Symmetry: none
Subunit: 216 residues, 2 copies
Amino acid sequence: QSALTQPPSASGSLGQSVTISCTGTSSDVGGYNYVSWYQQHAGKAPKVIIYEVNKRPSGVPDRFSGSKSGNTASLTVSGLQAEDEADYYCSSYEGSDNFVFGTGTKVTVLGQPKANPTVTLFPPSSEELQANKATLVCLISDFYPGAVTVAWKADGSPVKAGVETTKPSKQSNNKYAASSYLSLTPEQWKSHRSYSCQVTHEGSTVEKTVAPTECS
Amino acid sequence: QSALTQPPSASGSLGQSVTISCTGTSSDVGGYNYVSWYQQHAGKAPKVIIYEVNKRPSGVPDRFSGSKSGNTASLTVSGLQAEDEADYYCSSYEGSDNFVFGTGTKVTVLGQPKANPTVTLFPPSSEELQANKATLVCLISDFYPGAVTVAWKADGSPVKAGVETTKPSKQSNNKYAASSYLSLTPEQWKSHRSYSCQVTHEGSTVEKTVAPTECS
């Protein structure tokens, strides 16, 4: 219902400011002074970062900004944080206990430094065994470009079964995690000498080997 | 400034009626008599489905209904509709400078069987323990609507300082799984008595405990 209109993208680079518009109307946007800007870090709570026009709530930084001119409002983000990557929404009052919500934004700070994952393999759980199971997890974390890619290996040859592997996810910082998991029978654990969780990201390969050996 | 809580994932048959709750911290949370719900669709903008409590705003069909039995607000859907699939958010109202959005519910139309998680916790490997490293891993897998909540306790008290959870992914058999992780120092691991990974999902919540041990 004539959503307010927004820009489907808005790249910036650490320290650089940015500005997203939100085209409105004489009736939605230049009719009152009730434009809210919402965040949307992603797969989360919306979060309001500006209301009633140019009003920066309790605990947002000195750097978020809004100003409207005519039936157009806009959001400005000086010196780009690194977590400002999120989707951005405008919402305006439009008379009658009601509001309109012109779509997202999702900018991208760019020139984000790359990390390679901190692979961490994990042997099966005393408990798990005491249970007759055996899962091996391989946690991948603290990497940027969130296109990892992984393989298991049993004593130096592949294993193409019982291996679910999730998909990257942002993580409080601005690196992503992904766990790799492989399901085995206690017997199969003891049958082979080691298992390596082999992972390659942005060229780099990193392989961590775990052996049925310590306790558990 | 946070703290409005919602069931992770709520499921329905297609024709059935659902309910999503929203609770808080008292002398406002709900006491708050505002509380409006927002339906949010894949990559569409949150729209506003209910406001000021039980007040539908009118492009909106009448199955939507709202309420509060005190400290907790309720949104219920009647005659589940296919496009009723989505994420759903309760908004509460703060110091005029502070609109408060609760965690959002995922309504799914059950397209296969309901499956609660399988929670599996792994302590820190001796290796990691040697590298003056120390991480807990909480693997959560094989479950219906791909929504779950993750909480960690150190000796029974909540611990929220060093934790990352991976939104869930379809595995290769249509159920999902996610994992969370807590990174501490070995010291910090050797100090508590036990660590707990609690997972919540549709009527049930599993909690597992790991303890420290030399295993050597």
